[PDB]
């Protein structure tokens, strides 16, 4: 594979907080969006060059946010863009600067930095995580709050929606994971001891964990044994099956490619899934069947990483850091594996 680092400041030399690719993309060109302290959300056009190296093209600027923006999210269909941050306003941008975007609904109800947003599979439900110690469920069509999960006692820096639409996985800064059943609207599980997770000393503002695209397994970063990434299953969420050791700095991000790859084992199904884990200064690339990582890139950013994102086809793996610079990982035709 090849790694290309963006050496031009995307948001005028300010730290980058989030990245997201357009899930609605279905071809070779993918649309990427960025969040920064400049209170602006920049959507870029990312496509491979003739040599295969990543090329970034600026499309639009979204300066409606009054304060800094921490998380930017695309809908699974790619229609609606979710953006919230220091001003704590969740904007549902829609395609109306090369292009233009307009906010559909104002999903207000948060107080300060909103760190993690996860789209439900249907795209009509939102999970919102912010410093305010709460998780709020919203209706996209209604644009109104319907459920509240404020049991968190520290900075809620990570949340993901179950692809099967059964539970809600939340990671807070209190080294405690909280699972919320989607039908009961109450806490399903509580795990804090094998502490298991890293304390406030971990320097990343995010604790973004994500379910496996099928939802069978849950990968949680920022763990302790030493820094590691624990793996949970739907069968038992109160004991991790295994952990991936990451000596050095603590892992902060877990992102899984939405493309199912053929087997060339954490979970036993005829398909394997390649996911990306971002630490403070290193990135380890694993797959479902192989315990050891098949890829590792480091010493490419001068400061702490913030967010990563896979492309729709898996050909792009964007990496964002806090130094104002970003980077991408480019794979050739089906280098990761054979798609299903």
């Amino acid at each position: 594979m090849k790694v290309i680092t963006c050496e031009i400041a995307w948001h005028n030399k300010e730290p980058v907080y989030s990245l997201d690719f357009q899930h609605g993309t279905a071809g070779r060109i993918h649309r990427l969006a960025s969040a920064g302290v400049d209170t602006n959300v920049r959507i870029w056009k990312v496509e491979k060059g003739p040599d295969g190296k990543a090329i970034v093209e600026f499309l639009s600027n979204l300066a409606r946010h009054t304060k800094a923006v921490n998380v930017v999210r695309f809908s699974p269909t790619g229609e609606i863009l979710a953006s919230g941050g220091d001003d704590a306003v969740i904007l549902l941008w829609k395609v109306n600067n090369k292009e233009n975007w307009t906010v559909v609904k104002t999903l207000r109800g948060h107080l300060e930095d909103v760190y993690d947003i996860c789209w439900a599979t249907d795209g009509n439900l939102m999970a919102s995580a912010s410093v305010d110690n709460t998780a709020i469920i919203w209706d996209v069509s209604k644009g109104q709050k319907i459920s509240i999960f404020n049991e968190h006692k520290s900075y809620v820096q990570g949340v993901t929606w179950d692809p099967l639409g059964q539970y809600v996985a939340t990671l807070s800064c209190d080294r405690v994971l909280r699972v919320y059943s989607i039908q009961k609207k109450r806490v399903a599980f509580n795990v804090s001891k094998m502490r298991m997770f890293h304390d406030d000393s971990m320097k990343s503002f995010f604790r973004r964990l994500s379910f496996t695209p099928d939802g069978s397994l849950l990968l949680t970063p920022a763990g302790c044994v030493m820094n590691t990434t624990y793996v949970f299953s739907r069968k038992n969420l109160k004991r991790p099956i295994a952990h991936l050791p990451c000596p050095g700095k603590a892992t902060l991000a877990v992102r899984c490619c939405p493309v199912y790859f053929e087997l060339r084992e954490l979970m036993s199904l005829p398909y394997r899934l390649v996911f990306a884990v971002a630490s403070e200064d290193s990135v380890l690339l694993y797959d479902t069947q192989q315990s050891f990582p098949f890829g590792y890139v480091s010493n490419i950013h001068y400061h702490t990483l913030s967010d990563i994102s896979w492309s729709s086809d898996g050909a792009f793996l964007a990496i964002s850091s806090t130094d104002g610079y970003c980077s991408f990982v480019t794979f050739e035709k089906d280098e990761l594996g054979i798609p299903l």
Binding site: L244, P247, S291, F292, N299
Partner: peptide, 20 residues
């Protein structure tokens, strides 16, 4: 300045898997 060290596709042993 930084000295980049890049490892290609080898199908690292310092990061070998550890189980429990």
């Amino acid at each position: 300045v930084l000295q980049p060290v890049k490892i290609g596709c080898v199908w690292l042993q310092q990061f070998a898997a550890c189980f429990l």
